[PDB]
A paper describes a structure:
Pseudomonas aeruginosa CtpA is a carboxyl-terminal processing protease that partners with the outer membrane lipoprotein LbcA to degrade at least five cell wall-associated proteins, four of which are cell wall hydrolases. Instead, it requires the adaptor protein LbcA, the lipoprotein-binding partner of CtpA, for activity in vivo and in vitro. Therefore, it appears that LbcA interacts with CtpA to assemble an active proteolytic complex, which controls the activity of these enzymes by degrading them. We show that CtpA alone assembles as an inactive trimer of dimers and that LbcA is a right-handed spiral that might wrap around a substrate protein.
Author numbering: 51 to 573
The structure:
């Protein structure tokens, strides 16, 4: 281990902080200006000058002052921080490629190991803090979080077992319980949670975790009593009541969940989410009328689109597609802010219930209404590709990649279709390279990279890229691609063995079945 070897982790930390700063700037730019007090005073002043028809000339003069202009201060701070981070990153990439006595300069190695942004430095700082203040509950909780996220949960649990504060403090106890539940030994977590209520009776999260652990076992009857006790001690907590309704709804005890949801309706808190969950429960109860009447009264927000999708799905289950289209059009006319998302809902529902022609017609209608929506024509591309229509699929995909030269996924999609179907191999290499440079973390882009490398002739690079893409996430398509690429280079047993796992007797593995027949056909 040397200093140059340690600098990469520092660069990774700088990358994380740069990403966070840039995303922070992005969310700042969209956000409206905070009320503050100057705009509040101007609001009361406008409320005053509104009484007389004569213009409040002094109010207009003051409200248009040069100091009343939004300079976007925090956004500029975030941008400048991201810029200096990028500058330092560039500097230390320039320092990395240099050669020298990287070793035996122990002064800088200590600073490289004390960096809180590196995982090893995080752990070193946590160890130094536990040395300074031992048995600190929050420090143990943070170190256990670090160890569990690092991919070593059992070591974190063993660290928790050695500390006595893990039995007393609420957050370490909660983390130890959810860790023990993942080790398939949930019963060991039962007594500790009880002891927590002995130490923290008024703490609602501890009792909620106790109730969830009761639900985990078959002994759910006491969990209903725990719900009743929580409601008895804190009948005003609306978020706690919503969480109790959610856990009761997970344990398919529909009666108490419906009771809690109607109680939330009476208290006028989380009304749209409450009605959405009532609609889901009624859909489970096969009560189509109640589910529809509850989905219709879901207000706009983070639950309007799921309610619309569930309504469309129930309508398609009933077979009255005309009423489904009419309700979706009426909802589009009611709230046109994300009407494009309503069209996406319609397309998804029609594609998931075997109405290919109606899905294509709805997408055509949506594009006629919004010809510039970049999601709508991409959905048209996927529908045309499912319809074996490569022409429309190429036209709109070229359209979207020309209008947005920096749309990775669409840029990726066409490229993959270039490698898999046609023989325009030169464009596909550049297309997949650009998609990989835009977002290397995307595993479908890595799959496309292995596929174009395999069809281009480079067998080793294709195998490595497909191996990486398969390591990130298990997919049947990537599995078949890796199997075929490995089979072509040789090592038949390895390709045969890789196929054994991801077959899994899956109806989704219908495409995978054809890869085996194509290659075992030569036998």
């Amino acid at each position: 281990d040397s200093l140059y070897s340690l600098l990469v982790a520092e660069l990774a930390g700088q990358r994380n902080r740069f990403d966070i700063a840039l995303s922070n700037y992005v969310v700042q730019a969209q956000k409206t200006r905070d009320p503050g007090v100057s705009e509040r005073a101007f609001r009361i002043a406008e409320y005053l000058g509104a009484d007389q028809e004569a213009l409040d000339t002094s109010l207009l003069w003051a409200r248009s002052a040069p100091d009343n202009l939004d300079a976007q201060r925090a956004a500029a701070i975030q941008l400048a921080r991201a810029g200096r981070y990028e500058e330092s990153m560039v500097y230390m990439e320039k320092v990395l490629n240099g050669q020298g006595d990287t070793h035996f300069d122990f002064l800088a190695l200590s600073a490289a190991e004390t960096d809180p942004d590196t995982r090893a430095g995080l752990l070193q700082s946590f160890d130094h803090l536990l040395k300074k203040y031992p048995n600190n509950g929050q420090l143990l909780f943070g170190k256990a979080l670090l160890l569990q996220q690092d991919g070593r949960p059992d070591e974190a649990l063993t660290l928790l077992e050695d500390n006595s504060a893990s039995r007393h403090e609420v957050a370490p106890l909660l983390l130890r319980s959810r860790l023990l539940q993942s080790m398939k030994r949930s019963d060991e977590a039962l007594p500790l949670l009880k002891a927590g209520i002995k130490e923290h009776p008024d703490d609602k999260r501890v009792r909620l975790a106790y109730a969830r652990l009761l639900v985990e076992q078959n002994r759910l009857d006491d969990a209903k009593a725990e719900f009743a006790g929580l409601v008895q001690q804190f009948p005003d907590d609306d978020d706690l009541r919503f969480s109790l309704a959610l856990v009761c709804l997970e344990a398919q005890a529909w009666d108490e969940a419906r009771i809690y949801l109607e109680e939330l309706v009476e208290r006028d808190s989380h009304v749209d989410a409450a009605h959405f969950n009532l609609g889901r429960l009624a859909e489970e109860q096969k009560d189509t009328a109640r589910a529809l009447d509850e989905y219709a009264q879901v207000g706009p927000g983070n639950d309007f689109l799921p309610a619309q999708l569930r309504q469309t799905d129930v309508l398609l289950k009933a077979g009255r597609v005309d009423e489904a289209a009419q309700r979706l059009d009426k909802a589009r006319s009611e709230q046109p802010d994300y009407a494009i998302q309503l069209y996406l809902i319609e397309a998804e529902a029609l594609s998931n219930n075997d109405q290919q022609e109606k899905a294509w017609q709805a997408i055509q209608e949506g594009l006629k209404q919004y010809p510039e929506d970049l999601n709508l024509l991409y959905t048209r591309s996927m529908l045309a590709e499912k319809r074996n229509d490569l022409a429309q699929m190429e036209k709109d995909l070229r359209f979207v990649i020309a209008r947005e030269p920096d749309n990775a996924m669409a840029l990726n999609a066409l490229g993959y279709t270039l490698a898999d179907r046609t023989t325009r191999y030169g464009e596909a290499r550049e297309l997949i390279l650009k998609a990989h440079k835009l977002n290397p973390d995307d595993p479908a882009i890595l799959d496309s990279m292995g596929w174009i490398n395999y069809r281009q002739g480079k067998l080793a690079d294709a195998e490595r890229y497909l191996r990486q893409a398969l390591q990130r996430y298990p997919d049947h398509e990537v599995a078949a691609h890796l199997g075929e690429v490995l089979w072509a280079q040789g090592r038949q047993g390895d390709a045969r063995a890789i196929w054994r796992e991801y077959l899994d007797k899956q109806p989704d593995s219908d495409v995978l079945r054809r890869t085996i027949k194509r290659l075992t056909g030569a036998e």
